[PDB]
Amino acid sequence: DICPASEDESGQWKNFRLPDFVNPVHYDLHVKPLLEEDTYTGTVSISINLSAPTRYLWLHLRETRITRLPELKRPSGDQVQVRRCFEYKKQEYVVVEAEEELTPSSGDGLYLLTMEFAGWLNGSLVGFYRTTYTENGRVKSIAATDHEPTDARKSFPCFDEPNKKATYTISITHPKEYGALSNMPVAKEESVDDKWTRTTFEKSVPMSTYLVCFAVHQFDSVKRISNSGKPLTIYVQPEQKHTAEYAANITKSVFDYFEEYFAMNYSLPKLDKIAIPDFGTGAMENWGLITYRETNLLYDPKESASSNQQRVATVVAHELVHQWFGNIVTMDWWEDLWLNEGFASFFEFLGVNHAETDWQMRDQMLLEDVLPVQEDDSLMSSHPIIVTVTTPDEITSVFDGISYSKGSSILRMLEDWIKPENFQKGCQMYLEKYQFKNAKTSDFWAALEEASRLPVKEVMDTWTRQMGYPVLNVNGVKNITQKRFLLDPRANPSQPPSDLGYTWNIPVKWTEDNITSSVLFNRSEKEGITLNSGNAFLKINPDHIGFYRVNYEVATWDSIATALSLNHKTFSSADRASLIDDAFALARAQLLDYKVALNLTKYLKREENFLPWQRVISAVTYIISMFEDDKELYPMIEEYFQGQVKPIADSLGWNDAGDHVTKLLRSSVLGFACKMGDREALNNASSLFEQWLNGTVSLPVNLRLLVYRYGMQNSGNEISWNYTLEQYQKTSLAQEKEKLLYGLASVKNVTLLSRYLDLLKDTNLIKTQDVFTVIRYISYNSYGKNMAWNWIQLNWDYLVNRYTLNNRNLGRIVTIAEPFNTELQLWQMESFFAKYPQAGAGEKPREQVLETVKNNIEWLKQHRNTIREWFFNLL
């Protein structure tokens, strides 16, 4: 109204990107929330470096409105006359036109733009918002911000691009019963009324808008002091105070580890962590004020699982990495997002490995990132690590497996190739050089190139400027050739067009009789290379350290299966997982006969290690999933795999005994036993469930989820469903709540699942942060697979209105359709997508799930008979 929307395109504000010649230096930001009203107001004054004649100044603003007419100051100090302001919706700009036009800022002086604005605290989990929780029967409020990637512009008007780094001095006017937090320590507090306080924080270091954070809270705190002497504190609800201890421990340990590892001081005087009761992502690395979802921060050793402990430790470590990679040095543009996310996803493992010695974290990288993303990056609808992004929806979409997991994986390969010592030093030099500035990927290669003189740019470009990865084809034990690996054999291997033409410079490592050698396999060696003792067996890609698959000759694969049956310990746990993973992905891709892959599972009655069991379970889950409705194949696949896990499931038993990894193994192994229909494992689940319903018995922590799931699935009814729903409401621990939600989604009852789906619209019952989690849980239910899919279709307009098409989790919800494997189901998907063609952040997930479902249909056609034969002839 005061800056009305205009469809005037005839200016530079038509461009998606901000102009080069306008840079901010300093933000004077003041916000005043009316908590009980779900509104806030604010004023911002921004010091501006101008480099070119312009009659217009524009910056980002979404939803939040300008309250009066903006006012501008010349570097001399005089008031610049303003003709108009207008909003340009298409590119999320507010634009002000001078009755003038003025010249650059040539010295140390700068323009100053002052704007008044008003926004909403309700209906959203981005920008600046308020949510509630209950304490001693009273409803309490907390307000906070979440900005990454393009939501700072909702909180306040700003130059909302990662390279437009400016300095910040923030102040908030809030009721006195509340404390206020931000990036920097408190500088001064002053009484406005006898009811209100104005809290001003000290000047920030130059930082990106997406990192700017503030909160208004009545939380207690658990405190720690770094080796640096700086306070590290975790803010937490008084009720939940005891559950902040572990995170406090890890924060200290990992903070102290990283500061020494990166050879650089944490830039700020303090660091705070806080979990918002309703929070839209996992966690956010806001410099000095890291916000969390409760499940990722709050841990109770008396109620939480080892899985939960590891998750907390890992996310805390992840977030801490960002204080260096992302915060100190930021990517120049979102196309280089992996410089943030891949680095955090890599170093998170080093952090927690320091904190927790017997967690085998380094190996767990294979399970967490490497192998899962090799699935993702074998689709045509993957994308290169460096990604062209032209809209806010595209930007948010690339916060994905490629950025995180493949990012993490190619750094893991890089480190090993280049040696840890040199990788470390190179990272340090990168941090020294670009501190408080922005870097491109090119900048990082050159940094490590200074630390190795190895051809980092030449080699790593191949892993980074094109999607996908190679399979190494072994000819004669010793000759290898590279070929792009795609899950779909019908797909055109040259698409989409790549300058590098889908050949890679592959750092290749192999083990000859307990001795290790290294070669760079050059792109330009079109007809392959020969691996340099007269050997009878070459173990290529030890610990799956390189981001590629190895396809041995069938004879060799056959001999591996035999070696496993005779003495599996001949191979390391990682090597076993890796051979199993490759074989099954190769069979999936029609590059290896399924009989050969399945033959590798024969030894399993003697398998006792975590890594191979995890990758076996992953591979079987897919195959079992494809044959769910096949009355012929399914019982046979079930009977066999039931027999294979029985010994290890029996050996570990239904009790929390052993070290971290053993307990993780027991969980997944007992879960798989239950999934495969082992009557005794199911009986244990039902028995413990029945006891838990008696209201006294606290279940062994690493068995709970299984007991809620299989207990509800096998003996749940309305009475126990209602009980479980009450328990979910009554527990304060978010990690327990989440397990109970999975339990509730496990009932074999259409009426009860229907009630559950209806609860998604009730914000008193299911939190906004948890809606997509619940939909996904329901989709795993044999009835709910179709119920969840049907519900998101019927309620699509409702979800879009509630979350917006810019919401990443909403974009991704269509992946509940992954198990689909008929032409009928594919037609349903396409019909639905055609009806709602505005996909937003769901554009890529749609492409991916369509490719997956098409692969599934093909897979069934190609392999049903072969797999049937293998099982029939065996049983």
Ligand X SMILES: *[C@@H]1O[C@H](CO)[C@@H](O[C@@H]2O[C@H](CO)[C@@H](O)[C@H](O)[C@H]2NC(C)=O)[C@H](O)[C@H]1NC(C)=O
Ligand Y SMILES: *[C@@H]1O[C@H](CO)[C@@H](O)[C@H](O)[C@H]1NC(C)=O
Ligand Z SMILES: *[C@@H]1O[C@H](CO)[C@@H](O[C@@H]2O[C@H](CO)[C@@H](O[C@@H]3O[C@H](CO)[C@@H](O)[C@H](O)[C@H]3NC(C)=O)[C@H](O)[C@H]2NC(C)=O)[C@H](O)[C@H]1NC(C)=O
Ligand U SMILES: NC(=[NH2+])NCCC[C@H](N)C(=O)O
Give catalytic residues, as residue numbers: 319
Spatial CA neighbour of 281 closest among 772, 763, 715, 765: 772
- Of the candidates 479, 530, 562, 822, which one interacts with ligand Z according to CB under 6 A? 562
Is 525 annotated to bind a ligand? Reply is no
Is 322 annotated to bind a ligand? Reply is yes
3-state secondary structure of 154: helix
**Which neighbouring-strand residues pair with 96?**
57, 85
Total Cβ atoms within 10 A of residue 127: 21
Binding positions for ligand Z, 775-814, rule CB under 6 A: none
- Smallest gap from Cβ 606 to ligand Z, in A, equals 14
**Interacting residue ranges for ligand X, rule: CB under 6 A:** 38, 120, 122-124, 245-246, 249, 301, 718-719, 722, 749, 751-752, 755
283 binds, among ligand X, ligand Y, ligand U, none (CB under 5 to 8 A by kind): ligand U
**DSSP secondary structure letters along 108-143:** S--EEEEEEEEEE-SS-SSEEEEEEEEETTEEEEEE
Binding mask 129-168 for ligand U (x = CB under 6 A): -----------------x-x--------------------
Read off the amino acid at residue 66: I
| Interaction between residue 709 and ligand U (CB under 6 A) | no
- Find out whether 692 and 707 touch, Cβ atoms under 8 Å: yes
| Interaction between residue 65 and ligand Z (CB under 6 A) | no
| Interaction between residue 331 and ligand U (CB under 6 A) | no
Is 148 annotated to bind a ligand? Reply is yes
Q: What number of residues does the chain have?
A: 875
The residue whose Cβ lies closest to ligand X is: 123
- Of the candidates 6, 79, 191, 475, which one interacts with ligand Y according to CB under 6 A? 475
Is 308 annotated to bind a ligand? Reply is no
| Interatomic CA distance for residues 663 and 310, integer angstroms | 12
| Interaction between residue 349 and ligand Z (CB under 6 A) | no
Binding positions for ligand U, 616-655, rule CB under 6 A: none
Is 286 annotated to bind a ligand? Reply is yes
| Interatomic CA distance for residues 483 and 551, integer angstroms | 10
Residues touching ligand U: how many (CB under 6 A)?
11
Binding mask 304-343 for Zn ion (x = CB under 5 A): -------------------------------------x--
Binding mask 240-269 for ligand Y (x = CB under 6 A): -------------------------x----
Is 843 annotated to bind a ligand? Reply is no
| Interatomic CA distance for residues 128 and 136, integer angstroms | 26
For 13, 205, 210, 270, 473, the CA distances from 267, given in Å and listed in that order, are 35, 8, 17, 9, 48
Determine phi and psi for 804, rounding to 5 degrees: 75, 150
Read off the amino acid at residue 53: P
| Interaction between residue 650 and ligand Z (CB under 6 A) | yes
Asked, as a colleague might, if the bond just before 149 is cis with ω within 30 of 0, I would say yes
For 778, half-sphere exposure in the C-beta direction (CA atoms, 13 angstrom radius) is 27
3-state secondary structure of 856: helix
| Interaction between residue 283 and ligand U (CB under 6 A) | yes
- Smallest gap from Cβ 280 to ligand U, in A, equals 5
The residue whose Cβ lies closest to ligand Y is: 476
269 binds, among ligand X, ligand Z, Zn ion, none (CB under 5 to 8 A by kind): none
| Interaction between residue 282 and ligand U (CB under 6 A) | yes
Closest CB to ligand U among residues 162, 280: 280
Q: Is 203 exposed, middle or buried (0-12, 13-18, 19+ CB in 10 A)?
A: exposed
Residue 623 is encoded by which pair of tokens?
């195959």
| Interaction between residue 597 and ligand Z (CB under 6 A) | no
Q: After which residues is the chain broken (C to N over 2.5 A)?
A: 532
Closest CB to ligand U among residues 509, 808: 808
Closest CB to ligand Y among residues 555, 719: 555
- Smallest gap from Cβ 617 to ligand Z, in A, equals 18
| Interaction between residue 535 and ligand Y (CB under 6 A) | no
Helix residue ranges, H only, 589-678:
594-599, 610-626, 634-652, 660-675
- Smallest gap from Cβ 869 to ligand X, in A, equals 37
Residue 574 is encoded by which pair of tokens?
């990682």
| Interaction between residue 476 and ligand Y (CB under 6 A) | yes
Beta strands in 315-423 (DSSP E): 329-331
| Interatomic CA distance for residues 852 and 861, integer angstroms | 14
Binding positions for ligand Z, 662-681, rule CB under 6 A: 680
Determine phi and psi for 340, rounding to 5 degrees: -90, -65
Residue carrying the six token digits 């994986």: 409
Is 869 annotated to bind a ligand? Reply is no
The residue whose Cβ lies closest to ligand U is: 281
Helix axes 407-418, 441-452, angle to 10 degrees: 20
Residues touching ligand Y: how many (CB under 6 A)?
7
- Of the candidates 24, 280, 372, 407, which one interacts with ligand U according to CB under 6 A? 280
| Interaction between residue 636 and Zn ion (CB under 5 A) | no
Total Cβ atoms within 10 A of residue 850: 18
| Interaction between residue 290 and Zn ion (CB under 5 A) | no
| Interaction between residue 344 and Zn ion (CB under 5 A) | yes
| Interaction between residue 684 and ligand Z (CB under 6 A) | yes
Closest CB to ligand Y among residues 221, 473: 473
3-state secondary structure of 704: helix
**Which neighbouring-strand residues pair with 85?**
96
Residue 861 is encoded by which pair of tokens?
């056609």
Chain positions contacting ligand Z, by CB under 6 A: 558, 561-562, 595, 599, 602, 650, 680, 683-684, 687, 870, 873-874
Contacting positions for Zn ion (CB under 5 A): 341, 344
Residues that bind ligand Y (CB under 6 A): 228, 265, 475-476, 478-479, 530
Annotated binding site for substrate: 148, 282-286, 808
- Interface residues with ligand U (CB under 6 A) are 126, 146, 148, 280-284, 318, 399, 808
